[PDB]
């Protein structure tokens, strides 16, 4: 209905419908587990643009961030955005 | 030793490395970097202004006369250094 819940071998019997996963449920993953007020939007889904990425805005600045990659990658730029 | 020396600090890599740098060809030269986007395996284009190849001949040289070195200005070019 809507919510996600992050579980480890849950089991579902073949045969089962398989469809791609529509814009909402991916949503879910990421927006649900992190409350609205404390959501900090800097990045969104490689494979779904319309799919932000909100990480947990307090947890992200107290806990200190490691922004690694080569030469020419743009982590200059994400340091900026950021 | 310059092998792992150079591997360990390359920024980049291609795919089997570790035998290429000793199979690599004369004047072939494998280039990474953040001024090419690929890293490619090249040939450098040959010299036409060369730095002289200092490189004796030797068996023809061998294979002549005995030839009279002039020892006289060998040495005295040497006396002076
Ligand atoms: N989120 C992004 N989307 C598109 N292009 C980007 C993004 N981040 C960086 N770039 C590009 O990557 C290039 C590399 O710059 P940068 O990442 O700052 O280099 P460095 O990581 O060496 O500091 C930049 O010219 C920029 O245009
Ligand atoms: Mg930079």
């Known amino acids: 209905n809507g919510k996600f819940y992050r579980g480890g071998d849950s089991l579902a019997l073949p045969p089962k419908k398989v469809e791609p996963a529509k814009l909402d449920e991916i ?18 889904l490689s494979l779904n643009t319309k799919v932000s990425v909100p990480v947990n805005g307090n947890r992200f600045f107290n806990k200190h961030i490691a922004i ?8 200059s730029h994400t340091v900026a955005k950021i | 030793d310059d092998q792992n020396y150079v ?27 953040d001024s090419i986007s690929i890293p490619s395996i090249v040939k450098i284009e040959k010299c036409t202004i060369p730095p002289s190849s200092i490189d004796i001949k030797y068996l023809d ?21």
């Open chain 1, 68 to 75: 690694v990659g080569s030469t020419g990658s743009g982590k």
């Open chain 1, 27 to 44: 949503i879910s993953i990421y927006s649900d587990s992190i409350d609205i007020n404390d959501r900090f939007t800097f990045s969104s």
């Open chain 2, 61 to 81: 040289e061998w294979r002549k006369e005995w030839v009279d070195s002039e020892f006289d200005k060998i040495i005295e070019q040497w006396s002076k250094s």
């Open chain 2, 7 to 33: 591997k360990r600090l390359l920024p980049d890599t291609v795919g089997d490395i570790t035998n290429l740098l000793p199979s690599l060809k004369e004047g072939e030269a494998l280039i990474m970097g």
